[PDB]
Structure 1
Amino acid sequence: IAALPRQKVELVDPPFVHAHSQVAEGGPKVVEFTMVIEEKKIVIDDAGTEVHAMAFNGTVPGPLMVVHQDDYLELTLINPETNTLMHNIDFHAATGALGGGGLTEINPGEKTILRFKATKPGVFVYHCAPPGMVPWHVVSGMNGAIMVLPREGLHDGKGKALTYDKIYYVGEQDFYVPRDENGKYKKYEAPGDAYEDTVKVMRTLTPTHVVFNGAVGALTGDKAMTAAVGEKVLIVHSQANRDTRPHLIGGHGDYVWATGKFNTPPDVDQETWFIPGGAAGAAFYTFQQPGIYAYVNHNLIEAFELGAAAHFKVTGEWNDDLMTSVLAPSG
C-alpha cells in the first residue's frame, strides 16, 4: 500500500461535490481527506429556532467524499480543543470495527487517521456514533455520505454507460427541538444543556423539523440547484436516521439506485423512490423542460410544513409536445 500513489482531495460544502473523475483515471490509490468537527449553533427556520449542531467540516450534512472501488480512503479527523464533546466516525462503506467508530474516538484536542478499503461500490452514509450518545450526535446533524464509484463509472442494468453532467448532494435531517410550556422552541447556552430535553422529544419519534442541507429553505430561491434542458444530473440523497421518499416535482428519476448500491440494478422511470433511514440513494435524470422544479420528501406534510423542500432552476426551451396549456385557466 506504501507504493500506492496518494492524492489529497479538497472538500466542498454540500450540495456541491469536490472535483473527481467518473471513470477511474488509473489504478487504486490512497485518497486523503481531512475534516474538522465543529460544534456550532445553527438557526434552522425563519422563527429563529436554534439547534446545537455537531458538524463535519462545519456543515450539515458533512461533505460528500468521492473515491472509486478498491481505493483506500484515508481520513484525518480532528476534534478541536474548542469543542466540548467526544466524537468519532462510522462509515457504512467500511468493513470492521463498527465502520471505524471503535478506532476513531477523539476528545477535544485530539485527532486520528483511519484508512479503509472501499471494497463495495455505491453511496453510503457516514456518521458519528459515540457509545451511549449515538442517536443524539446523529440527529444533531453529525452525518454525511461518501460515494464509491465503480472503476469504469456508472452504468445501467443492461451495461450502457451513464455519464452525468452535474451532481448534487442533498442531505436530509430530522431535528427534534424541545419546546417550553407555551409552544415556544427553547434555546440553550451549550450542547449538553439540551440533552435531557432533546431525548424526551426524540422518544416520540416525531421530528419538529425535517430539512434539506441544514435549514428550511436552505436550497430554495437563489440557493436553488441549477441545470439546463438536456443536462444529465445525479442527485445523491441521504438520511442517517429516518426514512424519506424523494420526488422531483415536474420530473422523474430515470434511473434510481434506491438502495444506493451500484451492483444492484437501478429502478427506472421512478415517480417517487424510498430511502430508509440509515442509507443513501442516487437518482439520475435528464431534464426535458425548463422552469422551476421542487425536489421534496413526498410526505407532503414533511415537505411543506416541516421544511423538506428544495428547488431546481432549469434553463432552456419549453417542449409543447410533452405538455401544453390547450386552454389557459379561463371562466
Structure 2
Amino acid sequence: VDISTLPRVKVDLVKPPFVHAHDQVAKTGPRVVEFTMTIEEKKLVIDREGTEIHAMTFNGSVPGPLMVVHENDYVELRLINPDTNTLLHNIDFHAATGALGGGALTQVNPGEETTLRFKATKPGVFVYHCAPEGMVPWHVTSGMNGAIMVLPRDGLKDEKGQPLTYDKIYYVGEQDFYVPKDEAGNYKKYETPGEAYEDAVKAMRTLTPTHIVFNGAVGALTGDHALTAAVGERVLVVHSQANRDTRPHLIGGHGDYVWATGKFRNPPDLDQETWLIPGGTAGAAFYTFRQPGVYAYVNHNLIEAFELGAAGHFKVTGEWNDDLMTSVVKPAS
C-alpha cells in the first residue's frame, strides 16, 4: 500500500495519568497517527524527604504519555532531542516489529530529531522505552519509559466475545529508581551524568530499588491528584513497568476483567484480586465501581507500596450500598 494515500491524524498528548482523546471502536479506516515527543532531562524530587534525581523523560513526565492507536494503524513518531539535553537517546516500542523496536533507527544526539514509522500489527497495551546501546537500564530506570495502547478496531471484548466499554481510562506508570547510597545508607549526590554512571550501575546491580513510585513521585496520585470515579462507572486502568515485576491491586475493589500481560486477543482473567505484570510489560484492568469512598491502588508487595512509594488513591462519588457491605456493630468496648 501507498501509505501516502491514507488519512493522517495528529495527536496532541496529555500528561499521565490522563490519556488523550480517542475512540474505542474505530470510526475510520486505518490511519497514520502522528505523534511528537520532546525528550527532557530534568531534576525531579521523588519523595517526601526531598530526594532529587536527574530524570530522563519523554515529554517532561515520568512515565511518558500514553499513546493510543488502533490495530493496523501506522504510528509515526517525531522524536526531538533538544540541544539543552546532554545525552544520546532513542526509542524502542514493544508494539513494533524490527530494528530492536525502533531503537536501532532513532538514535538522536542533543540537537537532533528523527521520525520513525511502524505498523501497529498487534492489539494490546505495550511498553515503550529508551534503549541506547550499552546504557539501557540506566535510561529506563531514570524514568525514560511509557506505554502505547493498540486497540482492536472493534474495541475491547470480554471472555465471551461481548463488548466491554470503559467510561474513563487512566495510565499508571510504575517506576523503580536506584538512587546510589553510601555505606551508611544515605543517598549520594553527583555532579555530571558521567561521574554518576558507575555508582548508578552499582546501585542497579543490588536489584533493590530505593523508590518505587506511581506517576513519578511518592504521593503523586493522592490528594488533589487522586484518581476519580463515580459509582457505576466503568474504568480501565493501564499499568506499566518497564523493568521490574509488579502486582497491582485495587484496595476495596477488584479487576473485573484483567489482561495481566496486556494483549487483547486473549480473553481477560475475571475477578482478580491481584495480578502480576512482569517487568517489561503493560497490563490493563477493567472495573465497574460499586461503592463510593477512598480506594488505594497499590503494588501489593505492601512494603513496596507503603514504604517505597507504589500507592495511589481513587476518590469515588455516589451512594453507599449496605447490602454489599455494612458495619453491623461499629467498634466499641
- 1:183: Cα distance to partner? 2.4
The 1-side partners of 2:35 and 2:158 are apart by: 30
TM-score normalised to structure 2 length: 0.98
| 2:153 match: secondary structure | coil
1:312 equivalent to 2:314? Answer yes
Aligned equivalents of 1:116, 1:263: Cα separation in 2: 20
Residues 1:278 and 2:288 aligned together: no
1:302 matched to 2:304? The reply is: yes
CA positional deviation for 1:179? 1.9
The aligned counterpart of 2:82 is 80
Q: Name the residue aligned to 2:36.
A: 34
Deviations 1:155-212 (A, max 9, x none): 1121110110000000000000012343221222333332111111110100000000
Q: CA deviation at 1:50?
A: 1.3
Q: Are 1:50 and 1:187, in contact at CA under 8 Å, matched by a contact in 2?
A: no
Partner of 2:232: 230
1:69 — aligned with what? 71
Aligned counterpart, 2:51: 49
The C-alpha deviation readout for 1:245-294, integer Å capped at 9, x for no partner, is 00000000000001100001100000001100000000000000000000
Contact 2:181/2:203 (8 A) holds in 1: no
The residue type equivalent to 1:312 in the other structure is F
1:330 aligns with 2:324: no
Which residue number corresponds to residue 293 of structure 2?
291
Asked if the contact 1:156/1:266 (under 8 Å) is kept, the reply is yes
Aligned partners of 2:104 and 2:116: how far apart in 1?
11
SS at match of 2:320: coil
Structure 2 residue 206 is matched with structure 1 residue 215: no
- CA shift, 1:221, in A, is 1.5
Read off the aligned partner of 2:227 and give its amino acid letter. Answer: M
Per the TM alignment, residue 128 of structure 1 is displaced from its structure 2 partner at its CA by 0.4
Which amino acid is the alignment partner of residue 92 of structure 1? H
2:257 pairs with 250, 255, 258, which one? 255
* Partners of 1:216 and 1:307 within 8 A in 2: yes
Which one-letter code corresponds to 2:49 in the other structure?
A: A
Alignment of 1:5-44 (within 5 A): 5-44=7-46
Please list every run of at least 4 consecutive aligned residues from structure 1 whose deviation after the TM superposition is greater than 3 angstroms: none
8 Å CA contact retained: 1:229, 1:288 = yes
Distance 1:323 1:248 in 2: 16
Secondary structure of 2:305's aligned partner: helix
How many residue pairs match? The answer is 331
**Structure 2 equivalent of residue 148 of structure 1:** 150
Structure-2 residue corresponding to 1:60 = 62
AA in 2 matched with 1:53: A
One-letter identity of the residue aligned with 2:203: V
TM-score normalised over the length of structure 1: 0.99
Distance 1:142 1:110 in 2: 18
What is the Cα-based RMSD across aligned positions, in Å? 0.7
The aligned amino acid for 1:20 is H
Letter in 2 for 1:246: P
* SS of match in other structure, 1:102: helix
Contact 1:52 1:190 in 2 (8 A): no
Cα contact 1:90–1:101 (8 A) shared by 2: yes
Are the counterparts in 2 of residues 88 and 104 from structure 1 also a CA contact under 8 Å? yes
Structure 2 gap ranges (5+): none
Asked if 2 retains the 8 angstrom alpha-carbon contact of 1:44 and 1:216, the reply is yes
Task: Give the Cα separation in 1 of the matches to 2:194 and 2:72.
Answer: 40
Q: Is 2:184 aligned against 1:190?
A: no
Amino acid at match of 1:317: E
What whole-Å deviation, never above 9, does each CA across 1:207-244 have from its counterpart, x for those lacking one?
Answer: 00000010000001121000000000000000000000
